[PDB]
């Protein structure tokens, strides 16, 4: 789906190893989401209100959200292959 | 673009900041490729060939590759927002 290469990379793996990869991805997504949220909390007011854009702090936050969004494609792809969403916590 | 959320996240940014994000992305991609290369070399022959698939070392390599591919969607999306491939290293 989102990341076709995953299909080829996971060929030859048992559903068990794929579930391991999927659970790992779900755990990572929560970490990336909370990391971006923490960064958002201390962003300057002009940026939070949407009147100002740019600056090193704002870019660091954007990079955190980009990383989070990119990694989600891995989560959706793995869940898609596994056939279910494992419980990780 | 592949990573659609990136389009919303960069709105209002100057081409200079966008290029900064793109260059960082390109450097990251290169580091992720190198990383995946290093891991692959040390993988057993049974795995490299395909006569064997699984294990903690193989899954680790697969995760490095999945991360590499996922991050490329960021690079491609940013390049498209910038309007050109910037020089890096």
UniProtKB/TrEMBL annotation, chains A, B:
Q: Name one Pfam family in it.
A: Prok-TraM
Q: Name one GO biological process term.
A: negative regulation of DNA-templated transcription
Stored InterPro entries: Tscrpt_rep_TraM, Tscrpt_rep_TraM_sf
Xref: Gene3D superfamilies: HR1 repeat (1.10.287.160)
Identification of the protein by name: Quorum-sensing antiactivator
This protein's gene is called: traM2
